[PDB]
Amino acid sequence: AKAKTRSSRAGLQFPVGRVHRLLRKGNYAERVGAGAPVYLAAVLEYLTAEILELAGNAARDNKKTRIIPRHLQLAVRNDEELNKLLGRVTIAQGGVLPNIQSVLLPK
Amino acid sequence: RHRKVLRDNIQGITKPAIRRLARRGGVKRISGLIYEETRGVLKVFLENVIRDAVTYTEHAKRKTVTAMDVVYALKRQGRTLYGFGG
Amino acid sequence: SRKESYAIYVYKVLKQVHPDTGISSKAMSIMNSFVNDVFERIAGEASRLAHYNKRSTITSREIQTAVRLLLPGELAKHAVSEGTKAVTKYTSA
Amino acid sequence: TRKESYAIYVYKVLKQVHPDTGISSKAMSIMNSFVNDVFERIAGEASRLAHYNKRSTITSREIQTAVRLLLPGELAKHAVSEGTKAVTKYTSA
Amino acid sequence: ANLLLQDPFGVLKEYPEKLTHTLEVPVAAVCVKFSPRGDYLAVGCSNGAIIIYDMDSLKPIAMLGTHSGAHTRSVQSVCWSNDGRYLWSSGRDWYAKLWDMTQPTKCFQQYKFDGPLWSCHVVRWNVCIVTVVEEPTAYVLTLTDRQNAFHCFPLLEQDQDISGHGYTLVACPHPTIESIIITGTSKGWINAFQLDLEDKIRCCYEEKIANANIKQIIISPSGTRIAINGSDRTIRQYQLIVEHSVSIELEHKYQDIINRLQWNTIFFSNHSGEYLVASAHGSSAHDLYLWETSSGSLVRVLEGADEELLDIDWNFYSMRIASNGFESGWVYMWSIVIPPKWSALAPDFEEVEENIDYQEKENEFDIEEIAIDLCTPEKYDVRGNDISMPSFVIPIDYEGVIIQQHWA
Amino acid sequence: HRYRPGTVALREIRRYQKSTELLIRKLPFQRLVREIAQDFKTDLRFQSSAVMALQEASEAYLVGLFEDTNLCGIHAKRVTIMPKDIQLARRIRGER
DNA sequence: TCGAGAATCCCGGTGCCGAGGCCGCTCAATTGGTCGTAGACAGCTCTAGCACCGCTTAAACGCACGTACGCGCTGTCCCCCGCGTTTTAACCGCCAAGGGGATTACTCCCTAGTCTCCAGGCACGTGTCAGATATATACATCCGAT
DNA sequence: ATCGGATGTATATATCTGACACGTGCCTGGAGACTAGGGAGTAATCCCCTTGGCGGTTAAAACGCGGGGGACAGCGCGTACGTGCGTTTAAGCGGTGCTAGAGCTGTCTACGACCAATTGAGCGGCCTCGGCACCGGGATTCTCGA
């Protein structure tokens, strides 16, 4: 498609310039290969696309346009795969998943 | 030579072997339904470890799940195992 | 001073899937600090796989095997296939 | 060819504090594997700590501030004092 | 073919995307070849059976290997005729059986070979080029006016050496000439062989591209593109210039940069070969690939399976991909799905994908002898195929159909 | 002579807590590992000290679950563990 | 099985600021060259994993039985919820002040890199000794009967 | 309270074994000398953000009250888990065979580091406006005492 800006050679929206910088002056290994920041920028595109698909999806239910952090916890905890990926995490100012244990519900 | 699709080796984790694991945990009376539940919890623990233990070898291009790679599979899940190197 | 971020790069993925919605500046700092966390778990894990095997290179094969170690189940299989789709646009063109 | 261990350097410290007492070969391999694990906790923690302050040097000051994080409590107050004793006795001698 | 005349709005794809059947064949297979229509799938089975499947209900109609000529060892490759009448079957029991489905259990003529085989390829429905293992010529076996004289025609000139090139392992005939046979050596070199259908042959083309064991040579069905699968990790598609007189040139190279796998089988598209597929060799490669044969990019991946897929077939009528998952043995199958349409409930519905802003007209408040022909069949389908050839329908077994309630 | 319900168990506990051999047998556990590893590759070959490291890490987890099955079954005021006790101890710990 | 009650929902209008869209502008991205070296080949040796077999019996398996424990069903009482009235400190919005963080700019000294040296420590072959079975025994906890 | 066995448990020899502590050889990694060099320390400014205070306003907490229900003990049942006794059926073992794969060496080709030479996307800064806070009428509805 293009020549400059390697992301555009790959067809990503995440930079492969910045990721190839952050695999050298982060000191992860001695010599990072040339295909390695391309593969890593594609995965970080996809997981950001998977969240922001499901985030604005539950933005529509709320009926609001923009995404507040409350929509992000509703996109993460409602989805099992994302939940597993973000198991330890706490999303700041994000509420909880609305559930009651059903013993406590009335007769 | 022999294409044996192995099935129901889970019933070798016997009812008097979940009793003795119960005893080392220090529990007194076991229900009748534990024995088909612990095998459900044993087959979940072994599925998570061996899937990582194969992946470490499948990347390393071998056909042996060597004991460095089981130890690294357990270290990633936060259950380190001292006794086989690392 | 120049403190970089992934702020504009998340924005160009929000204007792909949901091309009318916006994002708050608190929920930008989550996605700026999400990408900074899945980085250190992928390059953190693929700096052991290229050390246990006595290699010295993060190739593009370890970032495949880092992703199949971390990401569970059907996010692994789709992000692996998003990877090799995007490194082959890189190698040919 | 050759596989290194911490087998002998454990063994001198066994005969230092228990001079009649032997050790097995399975329970040497635990004490070989234990030393390698306290390394990669300490040198892991003293590497991120060099990165967070944007230095590039593991000096002795980082490993004082990495022992003081991992080691819980009374082992922290000892192994700091067992360190700075031994970094004076290397420097002054 | 009238189902595709009614299925879409008018848009039909050029590759299947999803995978909707799976032949539960527990004994494993080696090769899967369809009929020249989409009806019959010949399955080259592992033990030595051939379990031929009707591709409408996923349960078989015959088994070639009951009366005479059953394969003792494995069966390697198979092709079909122009009409789908015969079967030419190459196996590892040192036997090439020409079967005929007029007698759908008995062979017609066999040949005890000197050893095992790799493949078979038919030019006419009787003559068939076979790949004898460890042989630097291709003893193409022809069924002559008598069946017995299988003339072991050595596909080599009497002077020419492929010493240093190994044996010939692949031979695939040309589609459009039908007389020049492209073969590829075990070490690098590619020959051409113009059979006179007398037995003079001309080594018009020889070359070497790269030192590998050439596992497979395919030609596109327009005779333009020719792809070569080596024993190293590359696919070289070439362009074919035959007026005889032949020379090729490099078009594209397809590799897996990530895992560096070997490509087992490769297959082309229908008309001019605008799409190249492949199946990789190593484990965790669970998916057939596609490539745009001009641009070169990985454009789509048939992500349906769970195992490694060994052989492949693309019949162009039903647009299916049959492939044996080599580990379990089951035949994975892809098909172009057609979603249902409620637009055919009444003769006027409409399925518009968006809330249309219909303009408000005035009407809302107000209160034959064409030419008729009955004789000709159809000539071209929606796919644009060679249709108006009423194919050899395989007859069902009307010798023992009454028995088939009792004991097979 | 048919000693009392319960005190064979406390004689059985003090034997097993004071001993350290492996409790699941070797050969049935080696066929469980070669059954579960068929899903992830076909014809693997386990190095025979990695069917000890999958034993002494697995029954040191099953024992560590029954120490936390017992603490919640005491909590329900009984001495009998049950499968509604196990699935609490996996859920509170975060295995679900 | 319900009409009074009240909390929630919801839909509205009016206002705020903070998301978004640009204007200039620097340093990080690109690249187009060298350069050696890491990894990718085949190749080979070998050892360790797998397959098998005969055995010996320790352990699983099944059943019978009786017993104690789970469970359920009571009644009790206590203590937690609900709510009104008074009380108080959180909050917001001021003020102001100065400490400390952040950057800049010299400066220097620690260390990375290289070489020259050599013995520490690695694997191996060694005897030997602290074990674990193999064995009778003194007595702690346990049990049926008293 | 306590008997009478009593029976496994923990306390003493025997003595064989193959695990280990030890003795020779060697080799490769560690130690020193010293070199250039850049990374950190050490000054310096400077001004941003935190600590302090206060004057309100009032949501919210603190408190006390009644009353209700949920906890907790008790009891009785019945079932199912334990105990053991008797009996199978693999596990363990050791042993031999076998070979597929692991490890290593060595060649040798691709390829990432690095340098400079150029620049253009990206961050910071600035305007701006619309998405949502924020409240009011009413309509539902959600419970509860009728």
Swiss-Prot record, chain B:
Highest taxon of the lineage: Eukaryota
Record's comment on post-translational modification: Demethylation is performed by JMJD6.
Modified residues (N6,N6-dimethyllysine): 4
N6-acetyllysine PTM positions: 15, 43, 63, 75
Cross-link Glycyl lysine isopeptide (Lys-Gly) (interchain with G-Cter in ubiquitin) per UniProt, renumbered positions: 75
Keyword Nucleus part of the UniProt annotation: yes
Modification sites for N6-methyllysine: 4
A Gene Ontology cellular-component term: nucleus
Modified residues (N6-succinyllysine): 15, 61, 75
Cross-link Glycyl lysine isopeptide (Lys-Gly) (interchain with G-Cter in UFM1) placement: 15
Sites of N6-methylated lysine modification: 4
Family (UniProt): Belongs to the histone H4 family.
Function: Core component of nucleosome. Nucleosomes wrap and compact DNA into chromatin, limiting DNA accessibility to the cellular machineries which require DNA as a template. Histones thereby play a central role in transcription regulation, DNA repair, DNA replication and chromosomal stability. DNA accessibility is regulated via a complex set of post-translational modifications of histones, also called histone code, and nucleosome remodeling.
Protein name as annotated: Histone H4
Lineage, top ranks: Eukaryota, Metazoa, Chordata, Craniata, Vertebrata
Curated annotation (Swiss-Prot), chain C:
Full protein stretch here: 33 to 125 of 126
Annotated crosslink Glycyl lysine isopeptide (Lys-Gly) (interchain with G-Cter in ubiquitin) location: 89
Family designation: Belongs to the histone H2B family.
Chain positions carrying an annotated carbohydrate: 81
Localization, UniProt: Nucleus; Chromosome
Record bears the keyword DNA-binding: yes
Annotated Gene Ontology cellular component terms: nucleosome; nucleus
A GO MF label: structural constituent of chromatin
Keywords: Acetylation, Chromosome, DNA-binding, Glycoprotein, Isopeptide bond, Nucleosome core, Nucleus, Phosphoprotein, Ubl conjugation
Post-translational modification: Monoubiquitination of Lys-89 by BRE1 gives a specific tag for epigenetic transcriptional activation and is also prerequisite for histone H3 'Lys-4' and 'Lys-79' methylation.
Superkingdom of the source species: Eukaryota
Role, per record: Core component of nucleosome. Nucleosomes wrap and compact DNA into chromatin, limiting DNA accessibility to the cellular machineries which require DNA as a template. Histones thereby play a central role in transcription regulation, DNA repair, DNA replication and chromosomal stability. DNA accessibility is regulated via a complex set of post-translational modifications of histones, also called histone code, and nucleosome remodeling.
Organism classification: Eukaryota, Metazoa, Chordata, Craniata, Vertebrata
Protein name per Swiss-Prot or TrEMBL: Histone H2B 1.1
Subunit structure: The nucleosome is a histone octamer containing two molecules each of H2A, H2B, H3 and H4 assembled in one H3-H4 heterotetramer and two H2A-H2B heterodimers. The octamer wraps approximately 147 bp of DNA.
